[PDB]
Amino acid sequence: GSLHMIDYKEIEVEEVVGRGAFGVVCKAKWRAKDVAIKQIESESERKAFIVELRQLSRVNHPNIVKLYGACLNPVCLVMEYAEGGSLYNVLHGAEPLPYYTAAHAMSWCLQCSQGVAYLHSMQPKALIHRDLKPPNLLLVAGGTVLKICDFGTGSAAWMAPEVFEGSNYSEKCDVFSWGIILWEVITRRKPFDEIGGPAFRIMWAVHNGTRPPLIKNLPKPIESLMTRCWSKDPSQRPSMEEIVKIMTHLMRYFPGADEPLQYPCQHSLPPGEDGRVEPYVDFAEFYRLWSVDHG
Ligand SMILES: CNC(=O)[C@@H](C)N(Cc1ccccc1OC(F)F)C(=O)c1cnc(C(=O)n2cc3ccc(C(N)=O)cc3c2)[nH]1
Numbered sequence: 001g002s003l004h005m006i007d008y009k010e011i012e013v014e015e016v017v018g019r020g021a022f023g024v025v026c027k028a029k030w031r032a033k034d035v036a037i038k039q040i041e042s043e044s045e046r047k048a049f050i051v052e053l054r055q056l057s058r059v060n061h062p063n064i065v066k067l068y069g070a071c072l073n074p075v076c077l078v079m080e081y082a083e084g085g086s087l088y089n090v091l092h093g094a095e096p097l098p099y100y101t102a103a104h105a106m107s108w109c110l111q112c113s114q115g116v117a118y119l120h121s122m123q124p125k126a127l128i129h130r131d132l133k134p135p136n137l138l139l140v141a142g143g144t145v146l147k148i149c150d151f152g153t154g155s156a157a158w159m160a161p162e163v164f165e166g167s168n169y170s171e172k173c174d175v176f177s178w179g180i181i182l183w184e185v186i187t188r189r190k191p192f193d194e195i196g197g198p199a200f201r202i203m204w205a206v207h208n209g210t211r212p213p214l215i216k217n218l219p220k221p222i223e224s225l226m227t228r229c230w231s232k233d234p235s236q237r238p239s240m241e242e243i244v245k246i247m248t249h250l251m252r253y254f255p256g257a258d259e260p261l262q263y264p265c266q267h268s269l270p271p272g273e274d275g276r277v278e279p280y281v282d283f284a285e286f287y288r289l290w291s292v293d294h295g
Contacts, residue, residue: 019041021048022150023152026039036078039077059151063115063146064115065138085138086138088135091134091185099264100281102282104259107251109181109182115148116132120174127151128171133157136148136149137149161176171240175229178243186281187278215277217279219283219290225238225246253289
């Protein structure tokens, strides 16, 4: 797919905004436009840089971050910038944390599934993301629109066990990750936070069948989707197209996802811990609206 070759001298490197999975990203100007630039830090990131460049130049989707072009001297990517923050910072970041609703949580997950289903529908082979997690997901438009980032592939908590068992694996690994993320936005908890120590400890746990705890009062239609997504056996996980369909159906019972995040929350996570956790979000309205349709 098309890319602007860009001359490094016609862009103005502003403020660093954060590190990606690899590289470093800065706000900047290019033809007086808001733009993010990503540059490699060390030489070990040049491979990731080429993968990302090749992969991102092929994709165009409203839930995937736009690539405008590149600069081959020095090596840098030029992307869309918008006001917002990572899903990680929205969920777990610095005070003050925003209030959000069940509708936001479900919409964020629908939007990620839409971008990933596009990736998995690529011809001749699926583009597998391989690193879906909230630090690689950006919220824009007042926290209502989700964009997938970091296509260059601390990620053990979201990794399907077949990937870190070094088996062969498919696009179903992304479905496992999406499932963990669904759990995370609903509970507002870090998956496997309690399992201390280095990463091999998470790997061991998940490899042996450990999953995040069940959620109190979670509707069965959502629970069923979530738990299928994190099936040990990848063939029992739904495809992303099926996820998109199911989440689209469910959204008719979650009005208000277009509301901006505007209110602060004092989020004290209540220790549930008897093998079940409370949702951060509230499902009473879902149940009310569902009963209106289904007796
Ligand atoms: C509260 N502060 C934050 O959450 C920081 C970490 N953040 C998001 C952000 C910045 C750099 C790298 C990663 C990142 O997290 C996530 F968005 F990928 C931003 O502030 C921010 C605001 N607007 C953006 C943005 O437009 N972009 C555009 C990006 C394009 C690609 C990548 C990437 N990692 O490949 C990050 C990008 C971040 N980022």
